[PDB]
Design a protein around this nucleic acid. Structure first.
Lengths: 127, 147, 120
RNA sequence: CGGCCGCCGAGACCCCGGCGCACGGACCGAUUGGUCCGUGAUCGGGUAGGCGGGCGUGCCGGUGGCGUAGAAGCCGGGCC
RNA sequence: CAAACUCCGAACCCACCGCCGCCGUAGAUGGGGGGAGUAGGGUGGCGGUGUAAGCCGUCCACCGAGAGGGGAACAACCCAG
RNA sequence: ACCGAUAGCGAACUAGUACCGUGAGGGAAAGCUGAAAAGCACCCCGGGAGGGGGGUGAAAAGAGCCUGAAACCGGGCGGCGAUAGGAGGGUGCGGCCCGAAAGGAAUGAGCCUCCCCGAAGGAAACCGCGGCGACGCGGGAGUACGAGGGGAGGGGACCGGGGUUGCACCGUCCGUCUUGAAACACGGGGCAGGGAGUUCGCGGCCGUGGCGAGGUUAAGGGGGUUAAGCCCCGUAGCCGCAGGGAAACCGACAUGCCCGCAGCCGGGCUUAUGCCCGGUGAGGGGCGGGGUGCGAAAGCGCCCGGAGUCACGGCCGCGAG
RNA sequence: CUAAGCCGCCCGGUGGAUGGCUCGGCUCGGGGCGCCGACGAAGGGCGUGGCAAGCUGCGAUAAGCCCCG
């Protein structure tokens, strides 16, 4: 757990420092402001392509999270999407947390939550 | 079994599809002539390619007799005669008819060539022979009969 | 372009087992045969009973990292192990007095692979 | 003009942690895949262009599912 | 006095050998195959020409295709990839 | 395995209709209430259109009728706001404001206090000495400190995140030809939908799979079926098996030698991988010999010791828009 | 308790995208069927409904008349 906690803190700091990568001139037009995205600048005179100081930065392979904690919920568990009680049954309470699919109705959510709580399984969205 | 995707799917977004400057890939001028144009006869744009990769592209050579008059002669080797002698039994091309073994090569092949080696003696009934073929057969022990 | 390797799961498992066996017995024959088997399918080796007859000896073990074809004649008694055999090739091998086995059987009979000859 | 003494100053050089790539090695997965270890002062900019992996959309053959206790779609927000 | 002279003649460059150094069995040198793009270059030193700007070659150092720190801003200059 | 109302025929509908031109001829736009009209009875106001009550309906979905986005406009709310300069942004933080959920958190947040280790790096007080001087040298000392890594106690509700704006420094938009773009070079009022390496034939390659001295079927035929799927046959043909030559025409190594990589065998060094030496060595290379064309001949060109063919996918070449 | 003005959220108007639907298109191996006219054709003009303008259908018997199923 020592290394796990150290790397979890490292990832938290890294992803707090990381910026939001957005295409060039995203703020200038509604067509881009309403649909935020990142697109690689490919112009011959594109300052962002040249990577000049004072312009928005570009994504790089160095921003990746540490391998051990990559893709984990900030609480430290491994997320698993569940659509029914049978799917929830195949989960590991010690290391994985169930996320109930957005599409399942409250009727089924009731049994999913009951089974999770009687099995001691963490639920990220218990309602 | 191995299936992939066309290069266009990856090129979607490259603004040129790997053709160089945007002014390239226009048409007949880009190809330097439509088809075999400019191969040397009247225009020499591809003369440098013709003189190396397609010699004899321009010119005439000897004649050719009409297909009708030409005669076709089927040819077999004494290596085959021995290697596939077992198969001929089923179709009857070869048989015993006494102590010796008679193979009639008149239903397949006309002239017997002398490449390979002869192992077992036999009598082959052919119409044409080669000097080396007959020498090999005589040395092995069989015989050559001009049926 | 990329070399995707053999598509046959049996062949892939055989390659893995070959490398494992080489590591187990501390030899190089099986790893050599493995990297020869993983050759591109347009370059996989095919050998003929004629070549086996030319370069083999009676009571010898031969390994072909590919296919064995039945063009020619065989007169020696040899134990040949190859990925696949044609009907004519196997018939000739058997009629000559030898046996046509697989690489797995060759390993099972000769774990150390002493005296085995590679042919391509 | 001839010299000297301190200080300030980069993404350069040094150190710590992290990512990927190249090469070699050991393991598991029934097709291109996955985990870990070792070396890198002699790996990490990039236009034309070459190669590899991945993200997303409509339909079909299968497999496992969700939904009037509220699907698709739409506005705002949280997390990877 | 000599670009279209040489009784002489460097620096320097080239070919080959031996060795040091470096690369190479984790496969170099080399060989075969698939796919290109490139046929307007610029600055900087040198040579011929021109009153000069410039024109034409040569050297491969930098921009083209190159961030960051400076010369006030600067394509080429300095540190630096 | 076709499109799904800017798509698909031009026309999903009173579409070859409306409309344009003297004429030959050209030719659009336009689908959706609800289960049921139950399609708003009655009341106040207005000239009327309508407005406000009150009813119907699960829901106004109210006929200007499924859902109802973007651009644009009006109002409310949070921040800024009349001495301040840069393409409207970047880095860092400070005001004001929002913070239920999906992020952390009373199984304890911001915060406060205490103890330990510590990379690269790294002082000063104090004392002695050298230099005209700025200052430097030796001890202090590799000490204090140092990225980060750990432990303990106190307090008890915020941290992360978001909107706007303030300050410090930096930053002359996007696509394009071009040696060179902020350019007084070209294309750039805004938003939504549509939009540009497709198909066949032939040839060269590669990734994989089947069979293999053979490979493969085309047209078509039979069985079965809801069906064009599925099963079997079909050797015509095509390529390969023998090359050389204009043609007539002739017509070859199933290995006779030498090197030799991997692999295998014997030996030595070596804890093991590993290294060296010697033999054998598939594949690979060099000879020798052979077939044919030219030659009087020598001698040269090409070829000869068996790997091809079919299929799926991909890259490119030529012709078709 | 800032006039104008700029950014962000909420509500409203404008607009008709998106999603869902589909009696319409498009393409097909096989199957069916392939001519009409002087006994006046195709095509067209004009009429015809109680309220009837378009389309469709019909023809002074005019969204129709008669007979067998």
């Amino acid at each position: 757990e020592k290394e796990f906690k150290r790397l979890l803190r490292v990832r938290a700091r890294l992803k707090r420092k990381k910026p939001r990568f957005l295409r060039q001139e995203w703020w200038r037009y509604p067509k881009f402001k309403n649909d935020p995205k990142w697109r690689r600048p490919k112009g011959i005179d594109s300052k962002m392509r040249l990577k000049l100081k004072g312009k928005p930065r570009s994504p790089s392979i160095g921003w990746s999270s540490p391998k051990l904690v990559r893709g984990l919920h900030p609480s430290g568990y491994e997320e698993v999407l569940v659509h029914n009680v049978k799917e929830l049954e195949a989960l590991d309470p010690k290391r994985q947390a169930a996320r109930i699919a957005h599409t399942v109705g409250k009727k089924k959510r009731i049994e999913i939550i009951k089974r999770a709580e009687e099995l001691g399984i963490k639920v990220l969205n218990p309602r | 079994m191995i299936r992939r995707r066309k290069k266009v799917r990856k090129l979607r977004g490259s603004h040129t599809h790997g053709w160089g400057c945007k002014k390239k890939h226009r048409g007949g001028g880009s190809k330097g002539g439509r088809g075999m144009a400019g191969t040397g006869k009247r225009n020499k744009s591809k003369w440098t390619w013709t003189i190396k990769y397609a010699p004899d592209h321009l010119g005439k050579r000897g004649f050719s007799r009409p297909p009708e008059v030409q005669r076709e002669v089927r040819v077999v080797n004494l290596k085959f005669i021995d290697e596939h002698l077992d198969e001929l039994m089923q179709m009857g091309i070869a048989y015993e008819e006494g102590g010796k073994i008679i193979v009639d090569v008149t239903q397949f092949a006309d002239k017997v060539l002398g490449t390979g080696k002869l192992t077992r003696p036999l009598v082959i009934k052919a119409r044409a022979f080669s000097p080396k073929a007959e020498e090999k057969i005589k040395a092995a022990g069989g015989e050559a009969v001009l049926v | 372009m990329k070399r995707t390797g053999p598509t046959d799961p049996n062949l892939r498992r055989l390659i893995r087992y070959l490398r494992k066996k080489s590591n187990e017995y501390g030899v190089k024959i099986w790893k050599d045969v493995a990297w020869r088997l993983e050759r591109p399918r347009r370059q996989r080796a095919e050998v003929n009973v004629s070549k086996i007859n030319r370069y083999a000896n009676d009571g010898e073990m031969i390994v072909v990292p590919g296919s064995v074809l039945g063009a020619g004649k065989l007169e020696k008694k040899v134990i040949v192990a190859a990925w696949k055999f044609s009907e004519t090739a196997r018939r000739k091998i058997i009629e000559a007095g030898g046996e046509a086995i697989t690489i797995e059987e060759l390993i099972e009979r000769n774990p150390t692979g002493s005296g085995v000859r590679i042919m391509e």
